[PDB]
Design an enzyme around this catalytic site. Structure first.
Site, PDB file in Angstrom:
ATOM      1  N   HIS A  36      59.437  20.837  16.578  1.00  0.00           N
ATOM      2  CA  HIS A  36      59.437  21.759  15.447  1.00  0.00           C
ATOM      3  C   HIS A  36      60.017  23.136  15.776  1.00  0.00           C
ATOM      4  O   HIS A  36      60.257  23.934  14.871  1.00  0.00           O
ATOM      5  CB  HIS A  36      58.031  21.859  14.806  1.00  0.00           C
ATOM      6  N   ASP A  63      56.594  15.103  17.815  1.00  0.00           N
ATOM      7  CA  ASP A  63      56.894  16.531  17.882  1.00  0.00           C
ATOM      8  C   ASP A  63      57.388  16.841  19.296  1.00  0.00           C
ATOM      9  O   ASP A  63      56.652  17.377  20.120  1.00  0.00           O
ATOM     10  CB  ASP A  63      55.673  17.387  17.519  1.00  0.00           C
ATOM     11  N   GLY A 141      53.215  30.520  17.945  1.00  0.00           N
ATOM     12  CA  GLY A 141      54.126  31.009  18.964  1.00  0.00           C
ATOM     13  C   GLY A 141      53.898  30.272  20.278  1.00  0.00           C
ATOM     14  O   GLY A 141      54.798  30.207  21.114  1.00  0.00           O
ATOM     15  N   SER A 143      53.526  27.235  20.467  1.00  0.00           N
ATOM     16  CA  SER A 143      54.263  25.984  20.266  1.00  0.00           C
ATOM     17  C   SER A 143      55.269  25.716  21.371  1.00  0.00           C
ATOM     18  O   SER A 143      56.034  26.603  21.756  1.00  0.00           O
ATOM     19  CB  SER A 143      55.057  26.047  18.968  1.00  0.00           C
ATOM     20  N   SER A 159      51.804  21.331  20.171  1.00  0.00           N
ATOM     21  CA  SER A 159      52.334  20.966  18.861  1.00  0.00           C
ATOM     22  C   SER A 159      51.737  21.792  17.724  1.00  0.00           C
ATOM     23  O   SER A 159      52.466  22.374  16.932  1.00  0.00           O
ATOM     24  CB  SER A 159      52.104  19.480  18.571  1.00  0.00           C
TER      25      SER A 159
END
Length: 198
Positions: A36, A63, A141, A143, A159
């Site tokens: 993502h 993801d 962030g 992520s 994720s």
């Protein structure tokens, strides 16, 4: 730039994510991160400089993604823990109940335990299945950032999770946290990647 798990990188001069792990694909240098975080060919920057581009990604459904880096980048078998480092020693998958930590540019290095596996997240873009759940906190962030045990076994990449109005789930008890990561093993095999270890 030096490639360390948990550090910030930008995508097409816009969104920010965190590096998962330094990897190689034959002679090509790269790092795994969350799907993502960017689309194929999107430009990644660290310290204001271009470091590479998104080579491939799967999101939603899964993801995952990997960024193909220029040969000038420096791959390191490490994950950020404050000003220090956790050495990446392998990718043995830990079981439910195991302690685990994560590293990212928003909440830094956080630890907790693995509470469940094969969890589905219903994100804005669609469902992402097969995620592992932990109760270490995180925030927007983080992520793409590293999930790793203190013994150095790389687990996966950040994720998503049940972030609160303040943007993270650090302000609620561990018992109420759902912090989800994409398992590392399927990312490595899907893209023929080898983890950089020390």
């Amino acid at each position: 730039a030096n490639i360390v798990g948990g550090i910030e990188y930008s995508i097409n001069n816009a969104s920010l994510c965190s590096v998962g792990f330094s990897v190689t694909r034959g002679a090509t240098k790269g790092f795994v991160t969350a799907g993502h975080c960017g689309t194929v060919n999107a430009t990644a920057r660290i310290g204001g400089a271009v470091v590479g581009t998104f080579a491939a990604r799967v999101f939603p459904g899964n993801d995952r993604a990997w960024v193909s880096l220029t040969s000038a980048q420096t791959l390191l078998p490490r994950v950020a823990n404050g000003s220090s480092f956790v050495t990446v020693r392998g990718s043995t998958e830990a079981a439910v109940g195991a302690a685990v930590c994560r590293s990212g540019r928003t909440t830094g290095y956080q630890c907790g335990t693995i509470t469940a596996k094969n969890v589905t997240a219903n994100y804005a873009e669609g469902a992402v299945r097969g995620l592992t759940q932990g109760n270490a906190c995180m925030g927007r962030g983080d992520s793409g950032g590293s999930w790793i045990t203190s013994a150095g076994q790389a687990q996966g990449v950040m994720s998503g999770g049940n972030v609160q109005s303040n943007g993270n789930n650090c302000g609620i008890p561990a018992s109420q946290r759902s912090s989800l990561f994409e398992r590392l093993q399927p990312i490595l095999s899907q893209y023929g990647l080898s983890l950089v270890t020390g």
